Design a binder for this molecule. Structure first.
Ligand SMILES: Cc1cc2c(cc1C)N(C(=O)CC(=O)O)c1c([nH]c(=O)[nH]c1=O)N2C[C@H](O)[C@H](O)[C@H](O)COP(=O)(O)O
Ligand SMILES: Cc1cc2c(cc1C)N(C(=O)CC(=O)O)c1c([nH]c(=O)[nH]c1=O)N2C[C@H](O)[C@H](O)[C@H](O)COP(=O)(O)O
Ligand SMILES: Cc1cc2c(cc1C)N(C(=O)CC(=O)O)c1c([nH]c(=O)[nH]c1=O)N2C[C@H](O)[C@H](O)[C@H](O)COP(=O)(O)O
Ligand SMILES: Cc1cc2c(cc1C)N(C(=O)CC(=O)O)c1c([nH]c(=O)[nH]c1=O)N2C[C@H](O)[C@H](O)[C@H](O)COP(=O)(O)O
Lengths: 333, 333, 333, 333
């Protein structure tokens, strides 16, 4: 595999069409899904030359842990849909690569099993109609050694995924929500979580500048600027288009991550030059899992690590902090 | 049906090609017809998160009536071209959905029959060479219980519809203007109508900011920002591209509706975020009528209602007023 | 024929490929040829409503003559390439339509024969190595009743027309320059012409704002903002993209015409809304001549007249002066 | 051959696919390779008219030598890949055309042999792990009569060329680096070179404005604004998009060249109108070499000379300095 696109082809061969569609699809007309890619393709980096590259490092410190890359595996529900080892295969590869893995509320293996893999994982929370179950998931996650609570705030309910409707997609009998329905989360829910844990709370799905400011005021340790991979509001702006304005507004008050459409180390570089602390990567990790299990995810993460190192050094950046100081220019594709 | 596009396919199968072309076509090169869609596709919404969505409502009050959605059925002439029940099928479905229906001057069933369906309808006026016939239509409409006069001001004559010319299209013998030629309307005509009725007068086909201001000064209760679905001046700007400037200029002095290219609940959301009070929907309603009569229109309106509720809640909006306060960002498609 | 595009298809059938290529082609990669069309397609008109259209007139006064439309036939060399009656067929149709016809220096019928058709024609000058021959053409033109000298200033030599090179195109033996090599014209040449005639001198091929100003200072009665239909410098900006800036800079000091890509009455409207006094139309007139001779040109001019009247009235304009006061908005195609 | 594109077709026929891919390809997704062309296609020139063109000259003085065109042959490694005479064929054609030729560090014929061809050549330096070998190449180049040191600063290592990876491309046994591994160059390396030679040092691969300023402060005689033909950082901005800002920032303190995507005389004109002193041309020279050896390169340079003269004169420019004073306008393609 020499690009992430090699893995999408591999995953399309092996997966059943309706599972590939569950993974690939977006809501509505898939306008936001496509725009996540268009928006990255329009960003060009202005590289610097003639800097010392003796010790290029792609490491970052985030939420109290060193990570090997400015990247984490996005929360993706039901990973046994893609491979029989599901979440355990992905979490093992992430651990071995030094990349944080986000354990999902809708994981198909229990969060305690996945946390036992090691690797200092994060836990993604959905707010539930039964509030007490949500705060219990939080405490379970903390008890199992998760290091951050990624509270997904853009799913008061699931978006309208027309591929899934047209396919009549449902979970196979052999795939379940192993940690066991949505209630809309509010700022009150955020405060209840913040009071229930000393772990950093990261709000995932923020796009408005005012909501990023309010997240800092609410005591969030981070946000993920995100339109949920184009799967929630169809017509929601790409996170990458809001990222620079949001980074300026929070002015270092929390970590600002971005996701949606990251498909190479060069894309990681673009996100960091626009001011991201780190990115999440979703679909490509599942392509690698579908294609070749744990080893597939290992190969993807090694490829991404090589691409990130290559892009940083070609742009004159010996550290991720230097990459955040790069300038960009919008172009035409 | 899971999108409005399902219905266009269904209508293309059943209708004669020349009737499908009468419905689908625009004037000239169809530049404005295409631009209505391009313009909406370029608008992205910046959704808000973590708001109270306990009681999401899509209702609005407009021209003294509660409507179930910020939407009305656009005036489309000669609906018996599309289905034998024509206007009565559409008006019954609109009534049952709580959506205003606009009765046309060129309706193929008389305005009194359509008004008898109920549902508090509106009436669309064309100015006629014989002025007295125009003011008589207005009084007929008012006597029959119509609740607003939608004065179409962008048809001094019909545009050059090249599909119709190439098809040699004419009305079948079985379709007539049942209320029974154009004269250009002027601001004097508007005042004559305003003096003849206490109903709100809504000027449909406004695109210039100055004309929107003058409409308020003339005592209009509303305007529809519109290029007539690309059927009048070819090269006229889309209404959606003028809407924000027009909403700022009238500064609440009348209702500001928009039409042209609305094809989903997400499109309704975009229009409201740009400041529209409500939208009109034309061709999709006729697709549903062609495909399946009254039940088809019912299914379309239920689908649009679901999409509007979904989009509003995903964007953090418990009311249409909140959706009007959303911000937008132009993107590249 | 219901659009100008009907005539291009008709002309492509009948003409030999290499003559069609001489007519259709541009210089280099044909970037400026394509951009002439792209630029018009990006312009949208903001029409006005509810104006008095009792007596819509498309007439203008220009260079001391009433013209029936804000349009003249562009100078196109060697019209016997397209039809055996060549220039006489076109000039007769232009006369009968009330449209000025530009007699070319490289006409395939002598300028005195074409002027004898009547219709108050214009004469297009190329500067010649032998200056005295240029001033003699001017005096011949004036003696024959031409009413303006259109001095083409963008041909110090002919551009690189790669279709013609690839075809090895040459004039058939039966087509000659009947008025009988280029020398670059300079501002000194302009003054020599201005001193030799009392007719208005119109400089065709101006694109820089400073050159439009200097044209007024030099005593020009008009300019044609033009990149020679994309046939001269490949990569030259379209005239339509410079027109608004040029109209503001000359601030009524001369007539400002534009050409390049005009293919409908709506395009004429766009040009006038951007401030043009009038347009020239080149290739479509030759398509009509190829397709059907004098009658073909008559049909084209009647179609353009109908489209101009239609577009003006739909945009609320009872006169060309009102159309020049319309506003425009750039869009995305 | 009537355009440079004729030669690409000719070279694709004759070369082995993997050698054509080595020549044509870029890094990553080839976004920067494509953007080099898109960026030029968006630039339109505003030509001037009616200027004296008695003695149009395309000559420039650069680095103490008159050159026949504002163009040099870019450094392209391993030219025996394309033709058995490799660098000697290209250097002979460049000499005879009066165009500087850049001898590569990775030339497949020794730099002393190529310099013996004559034509006052330049020498392109890569910094080597063994510094002393780099300064020895510099002194060899100077001893052999090279007139400038083109220090390539955008290759701390080679980019990820996915075509080459997919092809498993390696040099044939018959092609070697005849002057005989990378170390990252720094500003210290630049100073070491500047101290080792009195020849002008030209830094190739600058894109950031600050790096162009620093190059002047470091005593560079020139820079090449360049993304290495899209072969280094994928997602690096095109040089042509940075050129105007860089020319303003250095404000005559060094020569500012540009490369990437130059494919005609019109493209040379665009680059000069954006302020370049001169361009480099890479792939087209290798197409001509592949197609027809020395004579092929001669034909390409004669074609480019004709196109540059044509474009300059059509734009009213009797000298390259006048072309640098032309204005441009961005358009839409
Ligand atoms: C592709 C995919 C993404 C997601 C999910 C499933 C799939 C198949 N999950 C759900 O389906 C939730 C549900 O079923 O309601 C899910 C989720 N986000 C989250 O917080 N919890 C989730 O549990 N996401 C978005 C994700 O984390 C990234 O935001 C996006 O993947 C970045 O974009 P890319 O894919 O272009 O890298
Ligand atoms: C598709 C269609 C539209 C219209 C009509 C017929 C058809 C087949 N009517 C006429 O043909 C009038 C005539 O025959 O002179 C008609 C009319 N508008 C109006 O005031 N009175 C009309 O009587 N319109 C425009 C409409 O109300 C919306 O402005 C547009 O449909 C929103 O765009 P969309 O279709 O993308 O939702
Ligand atoms: C299509 C065509 C145009 C022209 C010519 C021939 C053809 C086949 N003539 C020449 O070939 C001159 C030569 O042989 O050196 C010619 C000329 N302009 C001029 O002053 N004198 C000419 O004698 N033009 C440009 C024209 O007048 C318009 O500028 C352009 O046509 C508007 O664009 P459109 O075509 O999109 O409407
Ligand atoms: C096409 C091609 C270009 C280059 C190379 C090989 C090929 C096949 N060289 C290398 O492969 C170096 C390596 O092997 O590490 C090479 C090089 N630049 C340089 O300083 N030294 C080099 O030795 N370039 C870039 C060049 O000089 C121009 O920047 C670019 O070609 C302008 O763009 P265009 O091609 O669109 O005109």
């Amino acid at each position: 595999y020499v690009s992430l696109a090699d893995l999408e082809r591999a995953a399309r061969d092996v997966l059943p069409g309706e599972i590939f569609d569950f993974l690939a699809g977006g809501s509505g007309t898939e306008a936001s899904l496509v725009a996540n890619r268009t928006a990255l393709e329009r960003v060009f980096v202005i590289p610097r030359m003639l800097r010392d590259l003796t010790d290029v490092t792609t490491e970052i410190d985030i939420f109290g842990r060193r990570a090997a890359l400015p990247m984490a595996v996005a929360p993706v529900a039901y990973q046994r849909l893609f491979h029989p080892e599901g979440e355990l295969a992905v979490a093992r590869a992430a651990r071995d690569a030094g990349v944080p893995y986000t354990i999902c509320t809708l994981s198909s293996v229990s969060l305690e099993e996945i946390a036992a893999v090691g690797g200092r994982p994060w836990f993604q929370l959905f707010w539930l109609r039964d509030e007490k179950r949500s705060l219990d998931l939080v405490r379970r996650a903390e008890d199992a050694g998760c290091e951050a609570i990624v509270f997904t705030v853009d799913v008061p309910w699931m978006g309208r995924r027309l591929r899934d409707m047209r396919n009549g997609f449902a979970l196979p009998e052999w795939v379940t929500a192993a940690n066991f329905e949505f209630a809309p989360a509010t700022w009150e829910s955020v405060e209840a979580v913040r009071a229930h844990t000393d772990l950093p709370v990261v709000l995932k799905g923020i796009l408005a500048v005012e909501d990023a400011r309010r997240a800092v005021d609410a005591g969030a340790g981070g946000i993920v600027v995100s339109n949920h991979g184009g799967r929630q509001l169809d017509g929601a702006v790409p996170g990458i288009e809001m990222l620079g304005e949001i980074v300026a507004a929070v002015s270092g008050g929390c970590e600002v991550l971005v996701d949606g459409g990251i498909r190479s180390g060069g894309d990681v570089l673009k996100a960091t030059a626009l001011g991201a602390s780190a990115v999440l990567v979703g679909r490509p990790v599942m392509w690698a899992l579908a294609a070749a299990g744990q080893d597939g995810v290992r190969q993807l993460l090694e490829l991404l690590a090589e691409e990130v190192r290559d892009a940083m050094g070609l742009a004159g950046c010996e550290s991720v902090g230097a990459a955040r100081r790069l300038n960009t220019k919008l172009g035409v594709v």
